[PDB]
Paper text:
The serine-rich repeat (SRR) glycoproteins of Gram-positive bacteria are an expanding family of microbial adhesins and virulence factors. Three of the SRR proteins (GspB of Streptococcus gordonii strain M99, Hsa of S. gordonii strain Challis, and SrpA of Streptococcus sanguinis strain SK36) bind human platelets through their interaction with glycocalicin, which is the carbohydrate-rich extracellular portion of the platelet membrane glycoprotein GPIbα. Among the best characterized of the SRR adhesins is GspB from S. gordonii, which has demonstrated binding affinity for the sialyl-T antigen carbohydrate decorating platelet glycoprotein GPIbα. Binding of these SRR adhesins to platelets is a high affinity process, with the interaction between GspB and glycocalicin having a KD of 2.38×10−8 M and appears to be a major factor in the pathogenesis of infective endocarditis, since the loss of GspB or Hsa expression results in a marked reduction in virulence.
We sought to identify the details of the interaction between GspBBR and the host receptor sialyl-T antigen. Dot blot assays using immobilized carbohydrates have demonstrated that GspB has high fidelity for sialyl-T antigen (i.e. NeuAcα(2–3)Galβ(1–3)GalNAc), one of the major carbohydrates on GPIbα, while Hsa binds to glycocalicin via either sialyl-T antigen or sialyllactose (Neu5Acα(2–6)Galβ(1–4)Glc). Site directed mutagenesis and in vivo studies in a rat model of infective endocarditis verified that this carbohydrate binding site within GspBBR mediates binding of S. gordonii strain M99 to sialyl-T antigen, the host carbohydrates of the platelet membrane receptor GPIbα, and intact platelets, and that this interaction is important for virulence. When PS2116 was tested with PS846 (M99ΔgspB) in this model, the strains had comparable but reduced densities within target tissues (as compared with WT M99), indicating that they were similarly reduced in virulence. These findings indicate that the predominant property of GspB contributing to the pathogenesis of endocarditis is its interaction with sialyl-T antigen.
Residue numbers in the entry: 399 to 521
The structure:
């Protein structure tokens, strides 16, 4: 397996101050096999949910040949509204990833996107 996994995540997901939310991403791979421990939802700079979105939670569950990545949490009532770019990163059993931190950063400079990138919109 040299072929990377593919995340399907909505390009925008909208959450609301004071409310709980739940959205999903799904993941396929040519090998149908994954490293779930290395499948995460994170911001650019580190494998963390990110400043201003520390309450962004996720879980990863395999069902058949797909991963189901639940993206969920409770938005604090006093969170800053606006847009937050975040990433679903998946890893196949062979260690291929859909996007690396370096690919994410280069896309950010160039005003573009990588597979698994999404916009978290807080209202
Ligand atoms: C601080 C800085 O300019 N660092 C750049 C770095 O820039 C970040 O790149 C991100 C890529 O995921 C985003 O483009 C960040 O911008 C936004 C975002 O997440 O979309 C803009 C939003 O308007 C802003 N939201 C609010 C409510 O202010 C968010 C938010 O501050 C952050 O997500 C943190 O929660 O930020 C952008 O800041 C990137 O361009 C790299 C490339 O190497 O270079 C510097 O590190
Ligand atoms: Mg693969």
């Amino acid at each position: 397996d040299t072929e990377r996994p593919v995340v399907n995540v909505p390009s925008e997901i909208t959450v609301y101050r004071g409310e709980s939310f739940e959205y999903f991403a799904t993941v396929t791979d040519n090998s149908n096999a994954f490293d779930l421990a290395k499948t995460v939802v994170r911001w650019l700079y580190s494998n963390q949910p990110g400043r201003g979105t520390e309450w962004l939670q996720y879980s990863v569950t395999q069902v058949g040949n797909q991963l189901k990545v639940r993206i969920f949490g409770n938005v604090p009532i006093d969170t800053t509204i606006g847009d937050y770019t975040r990433y679903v990163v998946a890893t196949d059993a062979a260690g291929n990833v859909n996007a690396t931190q370096t690919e994410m950063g280069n896309a950010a400079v160039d005003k573009t996107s990588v597979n698994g990138q999404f916009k978290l919109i807080i209202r």
